[model samples]
Target: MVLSEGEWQLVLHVWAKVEADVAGHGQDILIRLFKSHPETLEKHDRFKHLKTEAEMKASEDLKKLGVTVLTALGAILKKKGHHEAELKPLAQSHATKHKIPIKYLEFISEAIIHVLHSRHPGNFGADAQGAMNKALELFRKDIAAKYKELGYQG
Candidate 1:
């Protein structure tokens, strides 16, 4: 929870990277999510069509929300606080909302970075590592929470 200045900076950087990456290609995230958690789409009868449409609209809506969240997180974390405080809600909400596994959050995040670095070389660098760490920190909590529900300490 109590992150050093360096840690906070690192988290901010990761957030920046994810925000930038997700801001453009919504379909990419969906694809990555599918690859990471195939079961997520298994429940949906119209997986193909839904995935296609989600991919298209995701970029537009996700870009906006992602950017906004990144900015807020960067600002709040300009100092320090409980890391779990910030991260748990993000993970839980996404997981609960989409009915997907929390681990998939990490999958999607990593996938986003991988895609970003591969597609947009200009965006790849050490600058976003901190932000990524922060994002993962929060996301991991979500996964942990899920683990708790599943009867694992994590």
Candidate 2:
């Protein structure tokens, strides 16, 4: 279904809620992803034993990236296409290499919004709807870049 603008806002709301309980949500989501789509777990490491400190750092980074999306909507949108082009194959390659299916990459995108909305309730106001879209775009860009830095290539 095509989510309307208001529907999109609700999606953001859900994400902010999940973001509130970072450690809880992170572990649950990761574990579920690994189990449901084991291939997705292949591209990234530390899935089996994630550390709190590292998870906390990741939460902070994602938050900052969200804010960046709000601040630079256009640039992020432009960057994302290129980023996705790069990400898809890299994720596939990693999953294939690790003997994982690669279908898990789709779950990553699905889980992200839930995680973000859970973290930023106040910012999920009517006026902030555009910001949410922008934030998601930038978040994806940041993820792609981070993956690149980690030596993943499409």
Candidate 3:
């Protein structure tokens, strides 16, 4: 899952769009995830009552939560060694405390790809999409591997 230099640039280019407005982009990402897999929201107590995408977008905590997630993602994208420092801790908590299935990471990754393409149609073309897929897959693999190391069954 080592991204080529071109892939790295593509990830940064598209991620910049996501980072520009973490609240908006984060809501968009969650909305898409809930649309494709409503069951994913079961783990999120704050959003479990949200019946519609509008409700999800309007949630104050959701906005902050999205920013938090994006911040960690930003660290990972920088490849500044936070994958072990930041993402591993996240993976461990989700697996040990939350019991979130590793498969959900894949669901979120798909939603991210959808949002990136939808948000920047012109900038996120086939090549960019492929690069993003690889980048997210790398993230997923890292998380899943860490999850396993934590003694989770998933």
lDDT of each: 0.54, 0.47, 0.83
How do all models score by TM-score?
0.51, 0.36, 0.93
Q: lDDT per residue, candidate 3, 44-97, as tens digits?
A: 987789888778877888878877877878888888334678777788789988
Stretches of candidate 2 off by over 4 Å are: 1-3, 45-102, 109-154
For residue 63, give model 1's deviation from the true position in Å. 7.5
All-Cα superposition RMSD per candidate: 5.3, 9.3, 1.5
The TM-score that candidate 1 achieves is 0.51
Cα lDDT tens digits for candidate 2, 1-154: 1335554555455554654654555554454444555555445554434444356345544345344423333333334233555445544444345433223434654454444445455655554555455545454545545555556523
Top TM-score model = 3
Instruction: Output the better candidate (1/3) by TM-score.
Output: 3
**TM-score pick, better of 2 and 3:** 3
Q: Put down candidate 1 lDDT per residue, 1-154, tens digits, no spaces.
A: 3456666566555445555554454456555656666665564444544455456355454446545544544544543555445555544554455455555556656765666566655545665554555555654664576556644432
Q: Stretches of candidate 1 above 4 Å error?
A: 1-4, 14-22, 25-27, 35-37, 43-48, 51-98, 119-123, 126-138, 146-154
Lowest lDDT 10-residue stretch of candidate 2: 69-78
State which candidate, 1 or 2, has the greater lDDT: 1
